[model samples]
Target: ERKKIVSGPALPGKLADCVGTREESELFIVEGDSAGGSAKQARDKNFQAIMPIRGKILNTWEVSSDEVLASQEVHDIAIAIGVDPGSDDLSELRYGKICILADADSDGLHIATLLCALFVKHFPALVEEGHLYVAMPPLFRIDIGKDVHYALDDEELETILKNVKGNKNPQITRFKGLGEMNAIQLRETTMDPNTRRLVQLDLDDAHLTAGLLDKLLAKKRAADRKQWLEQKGNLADENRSVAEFTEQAYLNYAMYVIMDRALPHISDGLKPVQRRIVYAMSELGLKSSGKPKKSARTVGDVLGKYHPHGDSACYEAMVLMAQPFSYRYPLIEGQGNWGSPDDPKSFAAMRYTEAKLSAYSELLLSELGQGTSEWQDNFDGSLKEPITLPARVPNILLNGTTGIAVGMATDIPPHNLREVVKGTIALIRNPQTSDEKLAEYIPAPDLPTKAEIITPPEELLKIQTTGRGSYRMRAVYTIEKNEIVITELPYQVSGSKVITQIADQMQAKKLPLVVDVRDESDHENPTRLVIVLRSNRIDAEAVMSHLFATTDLESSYRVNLNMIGEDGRPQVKSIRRILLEWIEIRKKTVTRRLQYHLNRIEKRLHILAGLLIAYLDIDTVIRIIREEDQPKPVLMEHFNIDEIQAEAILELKLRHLAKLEEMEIRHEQDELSAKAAIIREQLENPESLKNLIISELKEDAKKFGDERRSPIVARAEAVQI
Candidate 1:
């Protein structure tokens, strides 16, 4: 009976469909019944189909799928399309193209949005697969130039004049809506699929998309939005300042972005996405030793459990963590196409790639189960997750990060693990080390690419002093056969982008010293750009320096150590403070872990003591259990034990009644006692705890650290002098 509404033999009664195959069929769902009249005449009768809805349809966003088809207009839409209401199977779809054509006004666009809600909620497969299209019917037919040319633009005509190249006498035809236009004009300008600007609706980010739609629709929840509208003054009130209302929404969203989404925490140096991805993967058991899972599987758990943001944003964040060039130490071990150094965003989608936690990430999550960090309820409160992973190292400096959140921004460069470790240890030992002494242990950013850092030593020191400075990065090049061969480029600068810019400069006659530039890079040679010189008489350094000034051969690696500190405020700190704060956090974590261990061990020791007491008087205990109806109270009274210890003794294993069991219990007691003693000492001694953290830090640096990829080199004599 239900199938009869959609897949019946005949189509909807009001639909004027053509006798064409499904492949060639195109359906134009116009705004009003009157507008359908013009669409019918404009449409090609052989392959075109026309259907119309009333002024407005039901808001279907919050409406359930079960009752969505109860509306006559929505019912007609489903029957004409020949697809189910809530199913993803589009095999029986009757039309190849589904276009919703509406006027360019508030009323017309409102009706258009209603139809969009119907399709997006009920017939989602149409929007995703067979494809849904919207043709915003052009309202402004204008004349601007000497030669009269018709231009039909949407929404408003004011933007057209501002965007126009030149204008003398610009005037509009004043004919807007599809019903007002002639059949020839409608067919030529919009109804024709060949030249019409049709935008296909797509679903990329579910959370953001769903969130915004809810705010627009949902009748019961409009009070909150309505309240804001009133507070900002009515839209009709011209006396109210528009600037004040604008500030409200932008300021609210930007602050939300800064606190929750954009900035990295100084404790672990990870944005919310980065932090959640690592924790979610850990929960999924995708460890460094374990077999990898599909990137799709990992991302789904992240979206479901921890971060309910855009899938694209989450996946892209995870991708960057796995990218070798993006981070000094990649957090995930990517098995498939995790993008390349040259084209960072050229990787396959989540489904096509596979990944697991890297060894470096293992160190970050090592103390997670040891109660060193705090856990909070997730978005919907179904489960709990760590606020920050217990990182053994100061990951902010090791991997670095860059983000611009509303009014504030952050840009920190990656440094070598060994160098950072040395500096951390130096700060720990002295507590008041000079900037010059700290600079000896750690210099400039050790970027992933093997380019030479040509920034002078004094300039580097100045950057270290103040938290704000840029490292002057230059490409490594050599001359061979009168051709300049570039072997490496500055960090984060794309090779192709640089080459294209240089080529455009040459075409514009700006690069007179160059004859031709060619890229000789392949799979083996990641960076091998060849430039042919115009004349052999040109000095190598002079030409190179000129190219450096003109192109991306020389770029500044900006350094700004802005991060969210422990007090939950974004701050910019120098190298010394970053290291000092890291030590403080380490001390706190180690103490918490020790205390956590001590509490657990003492509780078990309490239980073991109760069991030992029961074992010594075994015959009398057995007699009491055999005779007494209330064994728990009797045991508690007789043995002088608490109710918990009494219960522990009462529920003892039957095999433990043997003489060997007594020996085993005593042996376990000795073992726990020894273990608890060590933890107690560590908890009591501050120096011992710091030394332990230092040892762990040194061990991790030894295992994960490598020699610096970039080497510091001096600039050319003539260029510097």
Candidate 2:
């Protein structure tokens, strides 16, 4: 017998009421009539009920309480649940569980979110008292003969495939929605409490939830909604305390800046923009050997495909990579005038400049297709990109990097390619090598501008060991006819700025010994700042010392040795530790690549084995293939070969049946067998793998190594000024 009707609007006609009392009942707010029909049939008549929403329910948070009640779907939900608007009293509530049932798609998620917003905004008590719930539905169904498996996501699908027995390859079917499932499947997967997975929704912080709901659904708060939507694409959590939220948000932003913008990864020593530029250029076939393409084309490709940021930002980064005054080993080889050391930003716009990957950059990309690195889906999952390039040499130390991030900054100076490669090989040979020993090869920073490093060996060792400290840089000048002709300045020192400063100092009578400062820089002479002395009687040392004191001709570069390490965390690592970490990464990458090659070779060997078998009995194989319509199965049954082997036999041409072709197949099979054994041995022995990496490093060093530009010198107490 039914109890007396509750104090609310008449019971909804669409609701399939249960026979039991309200305390023992569960109400499934299903999405559509198609799903509702199956749910109504699947639900237990004694305790489970079904209420089919005709269409998407009104986003009540966007409307008034009165307007919310005016919607037929909302009215039905309120009446069926036997609850008054904005009332916290659970005494009038009709069901113990108020479950949302929707399709297993994005639209379904939206509907679920809208319903959650409704309950959290208008019916807080329902969510607060643990009555609100959501149903979990399967996304994929795999059929293996009679047995079936359900997968929620790609990871689960892989797990299911791994664990599934008897079926070598299962036929997988993806479901669009819950409506695609029959009543039996729906009940077993989503409706039955014992068999299904249900997520209980609770409003732990009603105020925070209400605020989020307002931003999401309130029409009048469109501006707030827009701002939240913009951040939602990046920031995920919004329920924490304001300070915690700000801290986390700032931390996330800082990480994006550090990883994606400000810092270079230790593996390739490239920021995201730099990596994307190289990758985009590679996709455009812009190799050092190929003709250069317009910089605008490369920038647009990078912006549209990989780095979806500003075009100007991408172009500027490309310009930096192409600048010899910036990187010791520039990755880009530009044909046009990139820029001058005097004015780094004076490079022409993207449309005028042309670029391709330099030989140095090709080292990072040469082994890319050989499976030397792991790949990840791009921003939109439309393409795959390497997580880190397979750098043959330690480009991080070879080219160096400089960036500023939150609460920290990095200023790593470049090292000689030859010395860095030698050090890497030494480290591989002896993993326990000391920093002092390694320093013998890579003694000091190898700046591209060919300046003099005056920091003493002891201080340089300290800096290399600690990954922090400063080193003094001086101009490479020569005295001619009582005049000092400055040619090379310190790394990254602006030539024009130094001249201007020197002229200003001379005008102000700060350099009484100096007469005039003139910039004689041209295309051929990148750094030619001539300083004429007042007289030959003036001491050259005193004049240089005075200029060093007041100008950038002599300066110090602070080293922070900070970079994104292999663990995906920012770290300040010493040169030894950095090289060791790279060795470990190289070991892993090479092992993976070897395994990949082994797998490919093994498959080829298998096919070749079958081909050889066919060649040995060519007449029989040809007879079976020509006489039988179903040659694959006939061959498989006759020769006891699998489908792949049988297919290989059937695919043989008349020409391949000759004696010469048969010998060639046999020869290939033998060669692959030998190669497979070698690869297998390499995999089994860690030392063998390390030796292989060491050999490759030596080969790369030989091919690309060059003489060091910047020269290290004995310690100077100070510039005499």
Candidate 3:
């Protein structure tokens, strides 16, 4: 039986235990020797237990699970406290509450984040049960003639000064680290229950928060550890001490980085529509093998990935993607039942839907995998999912990216992919190219799924370089003398309802651009909803631009790569870097394939030489061919050649070497020598190989120029050129 012993009055040499019983016992884990000593001296023996951690705790984000659990400090600390993580019966906790007390600095904040990760991963129940907290020491302490005033921020400090009537200039002292404070100063401001500032740990969105920690704290890069600092770099000069301001800025950035950008449920830190698009495509078996078919993913799948928190939320994001009315430039690409630029909402489902990877996506994925750029790993180290697909096209400008993160949202417009690519190329050629010159080449966005762009060329240039200003847009329209044109609408509109709603508004004079509507012929199945506007002079470009800018004719989406860091912080990546990453990846893949082929050819050459030696012996060749009744198989068995290599010899009629004259054998040997030379060159210079492949394709087309194959022949010729 365990004895119910209550000990108190002095610091327990064995445990550093508190003086009070279970009801009053409280422990504060002060980090850093200086801070702990101050807190210990300030602490009241009756209720406060101050334990100073000896050194920096291992950065959990960089280490493995086993390493973290086995750390001497962590193990000893846990044992000293007698608390097992994730335990439901927290009443058995040695201390009523565990508080992390550290200096008010960047290092302290990092230490705090580490401790949070430890509790979150190992002792989730303790965290969930509200047993964890952080101590917030004041940034500034103002002593107005012993009236002792403390302020958390500049504004508060200013406010306090404004109200105080002081004959003397108040002595303003800033505490950079906790070591500067003595025990008495530490107690009255931080440790004493009546005066201390305690920031409690709350589980607002556990799943999202946990995922963010997994990404930011994961130990992948030295930079990953300093990501918070980099983001906070801008805030350094905002206050008196750049470092302190930067620390606050870092804290703000960390919170934002952790919070979900769009739908938090299906996936946090990802834009709504991106989730939907991928989920929809996945449903269509895009990742599986089969004949290429029409896009069959639905709006529902988009919802699952995009607005995962609820069906309505998902549907709303899907609707916006298809709405030309909402964004200046939209990202969704769809066919069959998706409405036009003027209307939105009537989008279709998985079977009727068709989608493809955007050029931007292709570019991003290509670059990140090739080691040309950087990326974060998944929690289990099994997934190194890309933040954004590499784009040969400048998706950052073409479709644009926007999203609402924790306390912030971004709204960046799309630019022309070609222009963006050219601008990037120019920068590569001359890294110091002025923004003005770069802007000259980087034009306004030109979407693949055509739409009207109405901004002035100069205005477009300004936005491209400096990221300033907005562009105007209008819905596209064509007028003729009873001209009937059948043009598919922008991908934004999904169903007829949005069109009908617009028509209704037009009738009520709420919208003046639209004049009339027509339900045209049923070319497909159900019906065709066509609008026949009666405007006398339709400025198609202006109207289209206006539509795109104001109405749902086009919409924009933000790109946020739910990229996890070794330290467990997830980040949204830039599109330009992503493209470079993809190019690098493609380069590596092609190089590897070239090397693999080279190795295969070398092995084949060795085996073939052995077969030739056997061929030199007439008796061996005759006995093998006659007994086996297959010269190719006998050669293969004799030299251990693979089926493909043996078949090559047979097809070339080199298998009849036993009956051929010496000259014919010499000719075959020359052909093999030529083949080996080609293979070696292909391995050494893949670009040259590509050129050769193109040349061969041209030669083949010219040799087989047939009337029936004219169209295909012409296409091949054009492609090669």
Candidate 4:
């Protein structure tokens, strides 16, 4: 009763072998003769099938179905794979897996994109079935004497260096294209099952993937691309002006970096601007007392100095510092023109919008600055920033964070900042605080604007402790003797639809707690809408409990924190761990900036020396050394130093010539060398030794140009005449 194995007619030149019994075998479809030859040579003939695409393929997104089927390359591939172009029975597919092996270049990616678009558009189920993958080729090869290292990313290079022995010097080689690697190297790194590294393309969310791909790859629409360039600042496209083909080449590389590495993957979820802001604030010492700074600093300073990635990212982080709905208790107390919910326009300028440490933030900063708590340095080591808020305020409970990064995300709600802080302190004091007792202190968030909650107290407690439940907040009235008065506020803020819903219920006469509701006033500017109510029968508390059960005013706090990791990975880190990360990043930042400044000083010294050495005309050197006209060159030519180094001496007014009658030039040189050595050592490894010098220079620069951005300052010295 054995059925005869079915085999499709092999195309004249094609070497396709149908294995009816070996359906579990892996078949590789390679583009170009080079890849096919490598696959055939390296692959195990018994289980591996090789099919070479004739040439570059047409973009399936642009071509019609008929055009796609008519393409010789496509037809050959279809025949070799023993499946129809639009086959309904994908089970008839001869191989268990389909791998497209192609060159790692512009043309190769284009071909791969076309093939992917074909499967994605025509048979999405195949992708969903996890049958497609692209091969990963090494970008760099490092040789250390006899040992060779292949790295796919920058991180891999660092990893390889850690293992390299003997001399630390390693000759690094970057492959211009896949053709640079011979068939043996290619097969060994990419084709051999045991040694090759192939990144499997798994389609977790096909719909999202298709939408994003369409937006990015749809050539007809340049608007999206244009918009991206504008927002990111043309800095991303410096090479775009270098001819159309070159521009496209750079764009392709950039696109790969962004799509595969930069953009937070959808599966990781998107982080709303609000959450990022709060997280940033917590890291910046706005919430933690271990590190403190004045509110005079602008958001740009915080972001550029520490965040170090994007401008919008910084602005977004700063704006969230002000949002009431965005936080249970906003850490930053912003002054003048923060946004409102009805019209949420961001502040025009970081300078225009002033911010101060909140009460909680001040406490955190005090503690941090006093060196009682732990912290890490910024990436450049310019500042010591916190990793997380040291206080117990369940900021996540009072306010939420939401983000999408690397195919994952996070969403949490605001909790009352005061209550959160209290709960935290309580927890710190007593780690054994039960979820029930913790719930008592934290309770449910009491929104900035008010409404009455009608849910049962027990139910409310359950929601807070168990992290699940729903309630409503509505306007309510209580009978005070003969007069009926509005006595309760909604658990949600004032303007939420919960208010509108309450008004509607009053108009409909469904509110038993009120006999009538009278409109007192409705103001739009500050969002002060007041409605008076008269209660005739129902108890206010009962009505309040009912209100809590059915309105937006009553919301559950989904406590969670999924933040970006130092290595660009996303994970849920504890509050303390987050604080530590911020501190570490800040320390690193400060150190790096200090190092950069020290390096800059060297350049400055060189320029000064050139000016001093060329001081043939003392007047000319003086003028140019002062960076003015008619500068004297006495200091430059005499000292054998450059213009820059001459200027440094003249600015310092060290008077190297005054100290020596004989060997005037040598004395100047000796003085300059000694001073330069001190500066060089400080710059070489700044650590704490250079902090005093940096501070002194900063104060000196305040007299010339803007202190924040400028590098010059004038410090006056008292004459002892």
Candidate 5:
């Protein structure tokens, strides 16, 4: 029930009320204006009246009768019948009985139910008195010339056809709204007293009826109504072949896009294609120290060994990671025309380019060969692949990624290695460090373009705090004696386009104050492109304000820290959690590294002990080798040593019998035992392992870290001429 201010007209004005006495007068609650016209024309003028109610009435199942009068249509009906809404005393009632009428359609049935709710709740006094009647209009009629026969439904027509007409040209018809029926048809079929077909509503089992009404019309009963409709209604489920298969097929495709093709893993910060490239190159011996291989060969090996996808796509991924302007630290070191800021995708084909893994990529790859990672069979089970690289550093933050899967997506901006390493060490020193503390180490993002980030500090902090936001960056320029020179450009924005965009705008009279422009200064020089002014007296920064506003001189970079977790699930992570997830991975990898080292040291020490025993029994061991055919047991029995020591004695060279060889063995044994102690100590001590990881991270930082390229500043001033 909907309640509002009840202040409209007092009378229906459209009512064609009865003129006769109340003893014989009857009222018809017609569906709409047209149906009411048919009802007015059909009813006798003296004893029958017609009142038209438009549309569906409000469900008054919960509101008070006074509040229920908020509905103007219901209000009109109440006045037209000369009855009070709240009381049941019928001394002032205008009609002997009231009939509900409408079209024989689904919508009309909904309207009938709405009216039922209104009356059942607000006019309960009238329903129990047996004065409420619902008219049943036939849906079909069969006509043979002038002889008409009424049929209730489609089934009734077939029965009427077989029984009545065999050869006559009989016409059949379907009924709709009462508005479509003339007065004669409406009167004979639905309204005439002697041929009445109406159902009387009564107060039979009020508890049962009221309960069902609550489920049908109450505001909070949608769940109950749907349950009732699903169980008791004739509605059903259909189209299993088309609908069910389509549902499963889309899910299969979505999983493939999510798991195999897109979304980089957080640990190594590499997608499936990207991980395969790094691993395949490492297997092919393409490191920074190793001789470079043709990029085509790298793509070929990656395709045949691990990634069974397109060659061009694999090559493209490698090229992007190689470009200096693309990544803060390039993963692949490209020697040829592997592209520049002038055009990121303008690199020579794979056949012409030579590529190798960078020194930085070693952080993710070197740990793989140390038995620190889990391996899986490749696509065809012919070769093996690492499920995830055991990265020594958090490479995900070093070089972020951007990709779109089926319904999911990511757009991460690259950051500085020095800041990331510093923040990571902070995460290691204290596991409970806050984001504000980490922010001290990583002040803001550092793009490779050497541009200026104009975003405020608060937004930059919140971006990492929420793991989502955008950073505003703009190119740098120098006035240089009243002529402007663009020193830096936005990331991935080409110098060729900046000049072309300026030239186009200049010819179009957009930059009227600027006279000329040209692309100049190659090979890491600061002069990316220079523009001459129309007058030497013009304010350089003022002209730059126009360029920054109109061209790609300023472009924003969106940040999304989404990556697959170590548990193999993708999620966006805050700055603290991102460092925390990598901390867990680093702990495990270091643990495995130390344990493997301990095992190698202990095995070698076992052989060293055997050799030391043989040196003491040199004379006896010499005699045993010459006298006994199989002298291993003889040497063991005489020296009371194990056969392994005797076996070392038998393979001894003449030079090992020298006096200096004894000291060499003793010194080497002492060193081996000392090294074993440290590995053992760290393996058991958690703090010791953490210190080792911190030292390694600091070493990587010292070797590879450089000054940030993108400096932070506020938006440039116009400084009027």
Candidate 6:
């Protein structure tokens, strides 16, 4: 039985109907007024009709048929296509073909999908009978001389360019949308039946297509789809056992946790959060020398822009980067109270704290704008961020990292900045340098905390070679008038926590010779633990040994050289291997920076050449610019310069016509020419590039270098506790 047509409203005012018969008529649903206007001008007035949609069509797959018709966009689409809201029959249809025409961008694609949904749900007969169609638009247009060619994608553009005989550099234009194309180009490329490509919708199996669409589009069938997916099995999975599935699942999870979250890249020594925080700070202009901003401001910027995770998680990472006792070289300098070593979680609210990039962090940001690193889109593809910092030095060594992955963990101790720089330069000079010789410059970990490293030299050398070992750390102290005064504790060992542990041991009577423990820490003397002895009879060395055995006065720090390599895999690398990888990173960054500079100089030289041409005939140039309505093309034709150069010439200031300004432009051109030549030469030679990297490193060391904090002892000697 045929359903009755129940008309609700008049056709939309934006609808432009054709005067042809139903069999020859087509309804083109274009994206917006701009595109629809162009399509109208391009189409055949007798057969093709145009309907412009303001925005996206309503998605009727999830909405009820009655509710779908309530939406103005969906209602207009149905009414303009000459169909009822829920009818399956097409006997009342006005047009023979229902064509959806949208732009070639992502938003246009989404609109096409919504239109498809409306047709499939409300008018399935049209699609099944092959009356529904979608037009394909070109993405790029290539202009070679007077001939023009169109390409759908990059591959086709390359193919067209390769077949061209005359023009080596063709003028290529990317279509931002359908509005960019004129009426003639749009008609020939997308609207004309003789030249355009149209995809007709059809179904191979009606029942199968309906079943799959129900699973994907039906809101009530969501649970059934989920259950079906859970119970689904592959043809090859019959041979696999339960143990295989369990092992594979766990292995995948472990790899994700290790590489994505818990590990730092060897080049920058930062996990995902740390990298985003620094990059976001750079975006906000929160430099070392700039005024401080609220930590909350930075956290919000990070969450909204780069990192799409929780604000607290990002703020905590920022706090750790600012803490002096945590990182060997603090990347962020905090003005307010960031958490103390006593309790890492004792930090104030993000709004209460203020921070900016440190002087040390300038090493990472100095060369970033020079295109020293690769960039990737953020979570939403709204902005681009550096995949890794253009680090001038091996920050992985200057301020080490600590992380815990699923089945692995890393605890790399920090080293002195000056020593790491020297060692890197030496290794670059001699790739085959022995680990023993490298140790001459970088003997042991130079932690931010100024403590005594009691690990023997031979043991330290073995650890540096093997990339894993443990080192013993002791408190630096002195004997003062019948009492022992503790000065500095081991790295990461909190002063308050050590005192608490000592008091607990005393209550338990583990410390027998000691009398009283007092902490007199203040602004001047940051760490002071005075222990008054019960009497002079009790030996100080014995008391010291007892405290070391019971409290955190002495501790061991395990060194694990686990880090993400350049190959995107985690591995334990020796100091030599790490430094070598850094050298490779430096080479890539420096070469890219030089190439970036060379390109900029060449472009400036092009503009300078055009400017100099105009300066030679200032009156003629000014007359052409003032008298001609279209000066850009006139300038291009007169001087044989490209569009960029012509536009630059027209954009010159009035004062640039002066003789002094002309001489300055000439001088700048000469300087840039010489600099460009030098950059090109450095890029061509491997040794010169290496020397350039070394020289930059030396300059950085001179600016930010400081004395070593941790003192490395030759042998393990017992302290007087």
Best model number under TM-score: 2
Which digits, one per residue and each the tens of the lDDT, describe model 2 over residues 556-610?
Answer: 8899898878766677889999999998888887888888899999999888887
| CA shift of 89, model 3, Å | 24
lDDT, candidate 3, at 258? 35
User: What's the lDDT for residue 374 in model 6?
Assistant: 84
Model 4, 158-213: lDDT tens digits are 88888776765786765434555666777777667776666566655666666555
Clashes of each: 0, 0, 70, 130, 0, 1
lDDT (Cα) of model 2? 0.78
On residues 1-721, what C-alpha lDDT tens digit does candidate 5 reach at each position?
2222246533537877777868677878887765866787888888878777777677677878877667778777677665667777766666877777766644455566667666667676777777777777776767776677776556677887888745577666555456667888888777887664666666566676677776655667666754443243222111112122212222333344555555678788888888899898998899899889899998999889887669888999999998888888888996798877777888899998999999988888887877799987675445779988988878788788888764356777878888898898888888788888788888888888778989888899999899999888888988877589888898877788888988998888777788889777776874468899877789877788877887788887788777677765567788789889889998998899878878877877776777677676666666667788888887778777676655666666646543425677888889988988988888889899889889999898999888888898998543322
Q: What is the C-alpha RMSD of each candidate to the true structure, in Å?
A: 19.8, 12.7, 20.4, 18.4, 22.6, 15.0
* Reference-based lDDT, each prediction: 0.77, 0.78, 0.50, 0.50, 0.75, 0.78
The 10-residue segment with the lowest total lDDT in model 4: 704-713
Order of the predicted models by TM-score, top scorer first: 2, 6, 5, 1, 3, 4
lDDT of 5 at 502: 88
Kindly report which residue stretches of model 5 are placed more than 4 angstroms away from their true locations once superposed.
1-252, 524-527, 619-660, 717-721
Q: How should the candidates be ordered by lDDT, best one leading? A: 2, 6, 1, 5, 4, 3
Between prediction 1 and prediction 3, the one with superior TM-score is 1
Q: Candidate 6 on 1-721: residue-level lDDT in tens?
A: 2233466433636888787969889888897755977888999989988888888765587776766777878777776776776777677787888888877654565566667667777777777777788777786778777676777668778998888886456767655467777899889878888877666766546566555556544667666543333233111110222122222322333444565566688898888789999989988999888898999999999999987679888998999899988888889986888977778779899999998999889888888999788887675445788989988889998888887754467888989889989999999999988999999989999987777888989999988999999998878788876688898888889888888888887787767777789998878888888888887666777777767766678888899888878766677789989999989988998898999889999999998998888887778788888899998898888888889988888776656554435787899999999999889889899988889888988998999888988898653344443
Q: C-alpha displacement of 121 in model 6, angstroms?
A: 43
- Give a tens-digit lDDT track for model 3, residues 1-721: 1222355523245235665665456778777565755676788878878777775676554454445556766665565456543345565566667777776654566566666666666666766766677766777767776566776567768988888884956655554467767777788777888877776676556676554565455544335445653354233311122123223534644543433352121111134245445435544554323332344334454433333245555444544544434433343444445554444554665355554433223333333334332333321222333333322233334444455533333445444444555555554445567756765665454433333454566665555444445554323335453322324333334335436655666776755655665655354622343444445465444434433444444433223332332233334333333333333433444455445555655666654554455556646655665677577777678767667655654554334655545555556566666776876777687566545433433443344211210010000110100
TM-score, per-candidate, Cα-based: 0.60, 0.66, 0.42, 0.40, 0.64, 0.65
The 10 consecutive residues of candidate 2 with the worst lDDT sum are: 237-246
Cand. 4 Cα-lDDT: 0.50
